[PDB]
């Protein structure tokens, strides 16, 4: 995140962010204007003018540009990590040619056409080796593709015609066979462009919480503009007027330059972590709303578990090789795109390097995972391979004239003791082995719901299982309550009843199955759907299709709200010490009796103002890692967090400027600079 | 001293709460459209006779009714002062006022400020004081209580678009709150020695050869309204120190209660209309804590007084220079804080002749926005602007959306409160900077040194915040100060009522929601301190430099 490689590539762009192109940021535009005249004066003041001391104003004006430079360094640093990830996926799609067929049938004559000229309705051919040029649906053929461009997983996934798996994403790479697809998205709306639209600027307006404090920051700079610009006529009457270079330095200090140069960097750094969690949002406004949620709802209907439990081990019972287990377990899990199914495909390549499979040579029909069957599988050979839970398979194995081996039942009971839900793979009527699905979360998943519980956010699981089996998964996960056998009308009743009690609701689910529920919800994350389903409803898209990803969505939005809240309290609390540094110094030549207010015992009036300007510039660099990494807050209620935020960032905002001005002033005295 | 100064504060606040508690119930009825006991049938006969139809008005209509009455008010008053020579009840042959004096004083009384760039007995006739100044002491006070009625309704009413009827409120406020109570207060003044007649000026042949001319007039009636309506405009040049307007120490204790009567009852009323009395008491709690500390500072500052008195061989260093003998040093010090925190402006003792600290607290309580017990409606919705700001920053640092009384504050409402807060500090800093750059402004001073700038800083601070108190050392009868201050008074009043009404109209269309995880208790000590810190820090960051060049320099001098 902070390599000398990228910093040098940004600091050059930081110095390029110094011209008259900051008028959209009112705080830094005033700092830029103050730095402009103080150099315009000090140059003319040194050459030939009435004022007598020019090196002091050149030192003040020098740090004023350093203040503007440091503010641009934060914005470029946040945009440096984002633009780097955007360019990594930007080159993935420009490497491609495109061959469009005259006749939709395979084997026709195709000519190479630029990829950007592909429009909706075109028919393009992609054989093994090439990358998918554009999105659309598969109309002919069937092959396994690598969607690492959009998910970061090298695990394969099948895309065949005439089924639920005909959705291909442009930018990904095909591996096994050939595929004929029909483009359905226009240029500029490709799935890769939406990731570009989320990272690049000019397409992300300010969020309500972002607009919130900006109104206070503009109101504060209006106060500090009137408070200092009127000092000149007030002081010119009692004695000699305060010099302009001091009025500028005083105004630049009091103006909230701390957050005015860090505010735009917090939003850019937060949206990057959003993409890091494989969640696509149309604008930053949605991510902020996830942090203001009082209750989040997790829909478990379309999957086995909550999505936290993923494949851990391959266990063969009797007379079965572990290699032949994962070889068939992957084939059965290829049609299971749920997190439980994807992990089995992932463990297939991690232990046995099962990366590609020639789909056409199999002459197979894939059985997709359904919640009613509680199992997925494949009919590759003359025998049928299936994979599901313990209850659904025993009804299927005994249906094929097969019995349950005693060793298999002993293995399933042992994995149940460990706390992992066991899945079984069966070829025809003979059991191959058991797959263990342990929890991935580093800490206890009950603690993540407990941390969410400490803050007052309630968690309710939505599922269609029985009232007895749903409570078991709810107890193993540590959620508050659950909704079993949930009809699409029962989900709307739970959301509306929560909203009727004044509670913002977040929900994750399927875009098609939970279409009416996600619309009524205040915050919504769509699973197992493309960007088109959510872009119309203004919802987020979960690329991993994990119901637990809503927890990370709320946490990312929370950090974006905590950093802004903690820095405003820290920055405003600095103004107490900043007044005790400039008021006795700027008025020492007009009313010397005000020297008693110089509590910090600063050396000279010119050294006092220099130390305040240096601290007004060095505090930005010291807070850049805090603004971009995020505040590590603790789970507390509303009123309890108000106190802790006032203790750490209120007293810290009070004592740090006191100690900071002294050390900077003492260093100027020891070094004897001024 | 300290024990008697403590009992003066305790007796004042105890008697205040005893009187303001039942009055808050009567004000709650007027907010709830519920008529007063005896005023059930008379309203129906009168409203139809006047043409008031009890219709409900939206915020745009409610605002144009109040602004319409005020713009009509100064139009009548400005012409009364120009044609003062023609109107009757003029024993002396006082001529019509100049255009700058008439414009300033007309804007003054409509604004509820009552600035005095003139000497009453020398400048005004009985008709202009009675048919012009008393009539405007009611309407300006009624207009203030009308605005706070609409805002309070915007918090209790749910999912509506109307704020009541302004004409019904302006009638109910004057006829059954202002007029009857002031009638009792004015009669008690007369008994203790106040002036109330229409006699010509009386000549007095003293026991020595000197002869003096006495000023008569209907003073007692106007005296009750200026204190109850927090107008502060006295019949004479010395308003509250004059023995004719405030004869005894007993009437003075009554005058101090009248300043705090209605603005305290409006807190008891707001707490009753909202059902939860705690929401009204915390607002009353945050104001009294700042009030008690301010009175203790000025008392200690004035008791220390001028040490040059002791160096020159006097009995004590007590600063009796700008004071009266009927009222003690503690009483003059208490009154000085009461009349400046509550925007009344009634001067019991010349604030210019106060000490460095004793004069800075009245200076500071005006610049702060007249929030601490701000007299007559203006102080309540002024504090409400900071309550919304305190709630806003509270949720801003927690990471949740703001929510006061269940209603969630949106961005548009925060733009109006912010602008409303910036109104008065913009006028004082720009207004003072203009005076310190003109010969007509600086030459109007009296005392030299930092105190001389304090005279200019106190004038524009009082005018913009509508307080009306003055050092009086500044001679502001020039057309420059009359035009400069009238601009600060006009914009400082209606420039805040307009966004307050827009805040009102924006809050009714919202429906209060139940408490969630992100809600914050707007009662108890934690929010009191958060409110106090919000009001103090805003006024501090705005006036700390101008005060350093003012009374702070005089203190360290």
């Amino acid at each position: 995140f902070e390599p000398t490689l990228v910093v040098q590539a940004l600091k050059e762009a930081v110095k390029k962010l110094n011209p008259q192109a900051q008028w959209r940021n009112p705080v830094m535009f005033i700092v830029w204007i103050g730095s402009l005249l103080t150099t315009c004066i000090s140059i003319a003041m040194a050459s030939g003018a009435m004022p007598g001391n020019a090196l002091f104003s050149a030192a003040i004006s020098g740090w004023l540009w350093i203040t503007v430079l440091f503010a641009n360094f934060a914005e470029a640093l946040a945009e440096g990590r984002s633009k780097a990830q955007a360019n990594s996926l930007k080159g993935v799609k420009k490497t491609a040619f495109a061959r469009k067929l005259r006749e939709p049938k395979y084997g026709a004559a195709a000519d190479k056409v630029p990829a950007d000229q592909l429009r909706k309705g075109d028919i393009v051919l992609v054989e093994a080796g090439d990358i998918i040029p554009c999105d659309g649906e598969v109309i002919e053929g069937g092959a396994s593709v690598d969607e690492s461009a959009i998910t970061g997983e090298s695990a394969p996934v099948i895309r065949e015609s005439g089924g639920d798996f005909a959705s291909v994403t442009g930018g990904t790479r095909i591996l096994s066979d050939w595929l004929v697809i029909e483009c359905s998205v226009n240029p500029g709306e490709t799935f890769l462009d939406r990731m570009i639209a989320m990272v690049e600027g000019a397409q992300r307006r300010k969020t309500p919480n972002e607009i919130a404090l900006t109104i206070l920051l503009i109101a504060l700079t209006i106060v500090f503009l009137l408070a200092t610009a009127t000092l000149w006529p007030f002081s010119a009457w009692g004695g000699n007027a305060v010099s302009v270079t001091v009025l500028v330095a005083l105004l630049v200090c009091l103006i909230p330059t701390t957050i005015g140069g860090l505010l735009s960097a917090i939003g850019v750094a937060g949206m990057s972590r959003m993409l890091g969690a494989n969640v696509i949002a149309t604008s930053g406004r949605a991510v902020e709303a996830a942090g203001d949620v009082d209750v989040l709802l997790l829909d478990k209907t379309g999957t086995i578990t909550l999505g936290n439990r993923q494949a851990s081990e391959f266990i063969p019972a009797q007379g079965v090789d572990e290699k032949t287990l994962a070889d068939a377990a992957q084939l059965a899990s290829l049609a299971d795109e749920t997190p439980e199914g994807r992990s089995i495909v992932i463990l297939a390549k991690q232990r046995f390097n099962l990366r590609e499979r020639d789909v056409q040579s199999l002459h197979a029909t894939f059985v997709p995972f359904t919640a009613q069957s509680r199992m997925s599988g494949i009919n590759i050979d003359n025998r049928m391979i299936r994979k599901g839970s313990v209850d659904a398979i025993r009804r299927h194995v005994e249906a094929n004239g097969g019995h349950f081996p005693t060793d298999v039942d002993q293995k399933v009971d042992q994995v149940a003791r460990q706390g992992a839900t066991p899945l079984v793979v069966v070829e025809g009527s003979r059991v191959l082995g058991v797959i263990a699905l342990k929890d991935i979360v580093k800490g206890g998943i009950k603690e993540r719901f407990a941390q969410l519980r400490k803050m007052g956010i309630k968690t309710v699981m939505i599922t269609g299982d029985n009232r007895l089996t749903a409570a078991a998964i709810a107890a193993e996960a540590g959620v508050d309550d659950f909704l079993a056998e949930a009809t699409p009308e029962a989900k709307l009743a739970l959301i509306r009843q929560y909203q009727a009690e004044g509670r913002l609701v977040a929900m994750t689910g399927d875009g098609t199955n939970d279409a009416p529920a996600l619309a009524q919800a205040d915050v919504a994350v769509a699973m197992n759907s493309g960007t088109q389903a959510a872009k119309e409803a203004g919802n987020m898209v979960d690329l991993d299709s994990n119901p637990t990803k809503l927890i990370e969505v709320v946490h990312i939005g929370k950090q974006m709200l905590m950093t802004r809240g903690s820095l405003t309290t820290f920055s405003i609390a600095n103004d107490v010490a900043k007044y005790f540094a400039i008021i006795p110094a700027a008025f020492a030549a007009t009313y010397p009796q005000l020297n008693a207010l110089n509590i910090m015992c600063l050396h000279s009036p010119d050294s006092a103002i220099l130390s305040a300007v240096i601290f007004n510039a060095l505090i930005i660099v010291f807070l850049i890692p805090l603004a971009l990494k995020g505040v590590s807050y603790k789970p507390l209620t509303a009123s309890a967090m108000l106190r802790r935020n006032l203790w750490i960032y209120g007293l810290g905002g009070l004592l740090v400027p006191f100690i900071g001005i002294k050390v900077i002033d003492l260093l100027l005295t020891v070094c004897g600079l001024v | 001293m300290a024990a008697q100064g403590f009992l003066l504060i305790a007796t004042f606040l105890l008697v205040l709460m005893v009187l303001a508690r039942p009055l808050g119930s009567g004000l709650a009825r007027l907010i709830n459209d519920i008529p007063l006991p005896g005023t059930t049938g008379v309203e129906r006969v009168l409203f139809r006779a006047l043409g008031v139809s009890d219709r409900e008005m939206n915020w745009k209509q409610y605002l144009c009714a109040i602004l319409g009455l005020n713009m009509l008010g100064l139009a009548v008053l400005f012409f009364m002062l120009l044609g003062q020579h023609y109107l009757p009840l003029n024993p002396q042959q006082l001529p019509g006022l100049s255009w700058d004096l008439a414009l300033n004083t007309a804007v003054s009384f409509v604004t509820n400020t009552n600035w005095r760039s003139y000497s009453g007995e020398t400048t005004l006739s009985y008709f202009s004081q009675m048919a012009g100044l008393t009539v405007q002491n009611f309407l300006s006070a009624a207009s203030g209580i009308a605005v706070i009625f609409a805002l309070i309704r915007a918090f209790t009413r749910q999912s509506m678009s109307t704020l009541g009827n302004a004409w019904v409120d302006l009638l109910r406020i004057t006829l059954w709150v202002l007029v009857p109570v002031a009638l009792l207060i004015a009669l008690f003044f007369i008994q203790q020695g106040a002036l109330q007649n229409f006699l010509p000026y009386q000549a007095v042949n003293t026991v020595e050869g000197a002869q003096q001319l006495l000023p008569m007039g209907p003073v007692a009636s106007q005296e009750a309204i200026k204190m109850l309506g927090t107008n502060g405009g006295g019949f004479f040049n010395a308003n509250s120190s004059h023995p004719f307007e405030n004869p005894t120490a007993l009437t003075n204790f009554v005058q101090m209660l009248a300043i705090f009567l209605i603005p305290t009852a409006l807190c008891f009323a707001f707490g009753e209309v909202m059902g939860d009395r705690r929401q009204g008491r915390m607002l009353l709690w945050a104001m009294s804590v700042i009030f008690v500390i301010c009175v203790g500072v000025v008392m200690w500052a004035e008791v220390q007084g001028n040490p040059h008195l002791l160096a020159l061989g006097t009995d004590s260093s007590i600063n009796m220079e700008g004071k009266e003998s009927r009222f003690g040093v503690l009483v003059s010090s208490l009154f000085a804080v009461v009349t400046t925190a509550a925007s009344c402006g009634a001067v019991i003792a010349m604030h210019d002749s106060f000490t460095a600290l004793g004069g800075m607290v009245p200076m500071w309580l005006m610049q702060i926005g007249e929030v601490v017990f701000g007299g007559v409606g203006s102080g309540l919705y002024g504090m409400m602007l900071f309550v919304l700001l305190a709630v806003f920053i509270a949720g801003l640092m927690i990471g949740r959306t703001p929510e006061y009384l269940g209603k969630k504050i949106d961005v548009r409402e925060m733009k109006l409160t912010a602008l409303a807060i910036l109104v008065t500090p913009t006028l004082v800093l720009m207004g003072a900077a203009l005076a310190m750059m003109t010969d007509a402004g600086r030459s109007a001073m009296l005392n030299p040194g930092p105190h001389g700038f304090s005279e200019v800083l106190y004038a524009v601070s009082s005018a913009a915040n509508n307080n009306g108190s003055a050092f009086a050392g500044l001679s502001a009868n020039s057309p420059f100060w009359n035009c400069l201050l009238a601009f600060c008074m006009f914009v400082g009043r209606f420039g805040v009522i307009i966004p307050v009404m827009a805040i009102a109209g924006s809050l009714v269309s919202k429906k209060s929601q139940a408490a969630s995880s992100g809600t914050l208790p707007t009662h108890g000590p934690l929010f009191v301190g958060l409110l106090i810190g919000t009001v103090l820090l805003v006024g501090a960051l705005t006036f700390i430099p101008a005060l350093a060049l003012g009374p702070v320099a005089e203190y360290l001098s």
Binding site: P26, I211, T214, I222, L225, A229, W232, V244 | K415, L419
Partner: peptide, 27 residues
């Protein structure tokens, strides 16, 4: 009025209107 001072007054007024305009909007 001095030439250097009157320009500084014009600069304050232009920055005031620029800030009041910025507070009304979301830029």
């Amino acid at each position: 009025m001095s030439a250097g001072v009157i320009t500084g007054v014009l600069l304050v007024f232009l920055l005031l209107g620029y800030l009041v305009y910025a507070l009304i909007n979301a830029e």
